[PDB]
Design a protein around this nucleic acid. Sequence first.
DNA 1: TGTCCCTTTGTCTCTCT
DNA 2: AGAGAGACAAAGGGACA
Length: 492
Amino acid sequence: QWSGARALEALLTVAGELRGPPLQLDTGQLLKIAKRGGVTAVEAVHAWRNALTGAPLNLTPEQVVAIASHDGGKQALETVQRLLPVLCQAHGLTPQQVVAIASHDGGKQALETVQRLLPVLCQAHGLTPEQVVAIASHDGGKQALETVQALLPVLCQAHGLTPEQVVAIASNGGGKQALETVQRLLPVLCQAHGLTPQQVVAIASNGGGKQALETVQRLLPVLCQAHGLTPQQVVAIASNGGGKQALETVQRLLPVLCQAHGLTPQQVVAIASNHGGKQALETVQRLLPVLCQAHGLTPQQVVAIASNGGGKQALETVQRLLPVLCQAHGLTPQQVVAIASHDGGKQALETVQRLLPVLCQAHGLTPEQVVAIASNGGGKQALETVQRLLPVLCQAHGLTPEQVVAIASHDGGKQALETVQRLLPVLCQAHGLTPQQVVAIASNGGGRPALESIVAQLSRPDPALAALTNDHLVALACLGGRPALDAVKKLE
DNA sequence: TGTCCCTTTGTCTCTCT
DNA sequence: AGAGAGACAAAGGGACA
Ligand SMILES: [Mg+2]
């Protein structure tokens, strides 16, 4: 008999009881835990199904699932019950910060290291606890913290980094490796290749930090001479997420793409400078002629789709869905491209296919309005939030469909929609803001934190924003969102 | 096996002007 | 607003006990 038979059965046993109180998990939560945390993690969640759910700790099931669904999730769950009170009272962290720290593989290691090192890091190394929390909140968090403690002085003094840079480098998976590689390679990359420490920090400030710095060091010569590329264009490929894989794939496919399809180097750099760049490039070489065949898409439209993170998923979903979206849903190829040319194009595309008839028939939007909402990063999220929240923003808060679509139609629209639904009453009813002023504030990228900052002022007034009327705060909030507000906060 | 750590890719959100 | 930067997570491999 296949070994896994027993454990698998154990899994289904324990996981049927978890559909019971007090977590009520929905199959797609039990799977998640099962896949990443394993059976020990499903069986830890059961064994601690009460201790975690209410007084003392009081975690949402969402928050229990987040802690459990990683390797060592059992250890994390045990450690969180032990240290969360210790960390909120002895160190002053929110429990949401403790959950953040715990929700990665080896979470236990992270938690115990924050417990052990946060004093020495804040006192003797000058870090804020929020910096310590960010460093901690990735896989290998424990490693990154011990490495920060050890290398912060040598990185700042011998190498000229600001502690902020050291923290930005540290705050990724493999933070330890990136830090160590930045130490070793910073002088080599600066003194031999004329890179600013700033550019070295940007290369290092990703996952595959170590990998990207070493691949830049090895390949900058081969790329800038025998491949007509600038130091700037190599830095950009290496620091935008593509890292090692993207740089090596730029070597391979730069001539193939150009020579066979007439793409400039700038178009190749842009396709490269993203997460999964290598994937986008390879998919572009593979799929371009299929798309552009028989007066299909123009090349430039392929370059566009491809030049966002997830470009490969976007290219393949267009290939698959262009026909049905145009035939069955009355969309132009131009529209399909626009939806696709954003991070998560694939998600937006699939969500338009699913939700366009619903949003038109049941909610009275136009296809154009649907395309507009879908045509931003996180399109899937904005579109699903529009469906959830349209009848509520309209009926309960008096907003027009037009106004909702407008809040919806930026990056973060989901966040902006959910914040408007929650903050409109206190803003209007308690502080005299008009619905239109509220809709205006939220109708930008960063609508959410801009609404929250406006509320932070009219709820617990900083004396530094006092000479500003509501109408002035509103104008500032529209113009530069939270950062503009915090900008004036620094004036008193 | 369970746990810890690292890398790559995909996706979502916010900033900076 | 478009480019750039930063956050959040899924999934796989190495390493080791
Ligand atoms: Mg594994």
